[PDB]
Symmetry: C2
Subunit: 261 residues, 2 copies
């Protein structure tokens, strides 16, 4: 179909502002960019390169568990968080802790995921259906400041839309994964709320391509997309009860993975 991601990737490659961070890393970047995907037309797992959906799905279930220790990821062979874990596998109060138990001054702890699902079911027109990981007073404890910092849901004509704000975006390595993650989340929330899927909107702050990814990006940009796959979910009575085996990505026909430093 269409290629919102590839278009943005190309746009930053071709018009992005050059930078270097004293260490000499180097980037090309644009600020405040936006992609939309119509989820009803297909699941936005990129086909111009294979995206490792297994890690996407496990990491999401891990967030949904409200988990802060990489142990569970490791058990399932997901190593993306390994770099930043403590000697004990702890990461501080990151996404999972904030999504499921943001500490309030009242001493209460807020499960934003259940709260959002309750709004989707009882007050679907609410303009306050929001989940934030950007807990200003806790950031320094986290291993890293939240990248996908907050998201908002919206309902129209029985369809659920979701918009993510992502403060920082490695367009080549990170974003394809980020897109799959929040699209998957949107399917889970929709099913649990008794809704169909609408749009996923990705809004980025600093959208950058690392200089050492440029060849990988040009190869990908030279490839023609296949149709998006179809996402299927087994039945569960709670979003917190989805397991990896409940998820099928059907008819995913990607070009080969591109390995990048």
């Amino acid at each position: 179909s269409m290629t919102p991601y590839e278009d943005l990737l190309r746009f930053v490659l071709e018009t992005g502002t050059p930078k270097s961070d004293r260490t000499g890393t180097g980037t090309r970047s644009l600020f405040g960019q936006q992609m939309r995907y119509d989820l009803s037309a297909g699941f936005p797992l990129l086909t111009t390169k294979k995206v490792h959906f297994k890690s996407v799905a496990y990491e999401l279930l891990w967030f949904l568990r409200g988990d802060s220790n990489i142990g569970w990821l490791h058990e399932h062979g997901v190593t993306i968080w390994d770099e930043w874990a403590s000697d004990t596998g702890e990461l501080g109060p990151i996404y999972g802790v904030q999504w499921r138990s943001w500490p309030a001054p009242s001493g209460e702890h807020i499960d934003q995921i259940s709260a959002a699902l309750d709004l989707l079911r009882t007050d679907p027109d609410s303009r306050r259906i929001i989940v934030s990981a950007w807990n200003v007073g806790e950031i320094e404890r986290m291993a890293l400041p939240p990248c996908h910092a907050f998201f908002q849901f919206y309902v129209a004509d029985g369809r659920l839309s979701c918009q993510l704000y992502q403060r920082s975006a490695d367009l080549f390595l990170g974003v394809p994964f980020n897109i799959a993650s929040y699209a998957l989340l949107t399917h889970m929330m929709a099913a649990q709320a008794g809704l169909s899927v609408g749009e996923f909107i990705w809004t980025g702050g600093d959208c950058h391509i690392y200089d050492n990814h440029v060849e990988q990006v040009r190869l990908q940009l030279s490839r023609e997309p296949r149709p998006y796959p179809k996402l299927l979910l087994a039945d569960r009575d709670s979003i917190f009860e989805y397991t990896y085996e409940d998820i099928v990505v059907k008819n995913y026909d990607p070009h080969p993975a591109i390995k990048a430093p």
Copy 2:
């Protein structure tokens, strides 16, 4: 370029209807303005920039009370205030004094300025009003919830995430407000201005604003004004008189319906 009017028209013509006051709405929309080419105070109606400027200065004070705003002839917040003029820890309180677990209070405005001066390439220059645990204490939940700064070639850009947007009444304020904030931050960080990017969640036109919108949309847009800021040693020392808008030549104000 008139992103505002374009968006307003887009929603009027394609927004999905709702109830119940009643709206037309679209979700996840974005506008961008090049601040170096003009100050985005709308000209298709006379915007009450006095309220915009005072409200922003008031946010910067980190005030939870309407008094200072109210006594300057700005009454937009009056209806939501308590007996004492109190609002709970809204916008400015979070900007200037987000309460941390340590008992410390975080001044996100000063911290943002700090990064802009010492580490302008940072991808974490963020100010948030969306304090999940304190929103129940606020008179109403933050609308312009979260914003981010970015620097390229000595120019400061700013992106606002606005969760909910009354397109006719609120957005022209929101746009001018953050544009003005971006000028203040740039001047204090010793940068020039780049782009203001407005990103909206629920973007709506109220059914009782439809005629006002059609009137606004029938007017031809004019050249944007220019903003000038007198010099100050601190963002917290700007006054209303420091803020000068030149060449502002708008069509007539359009009264908010009762």
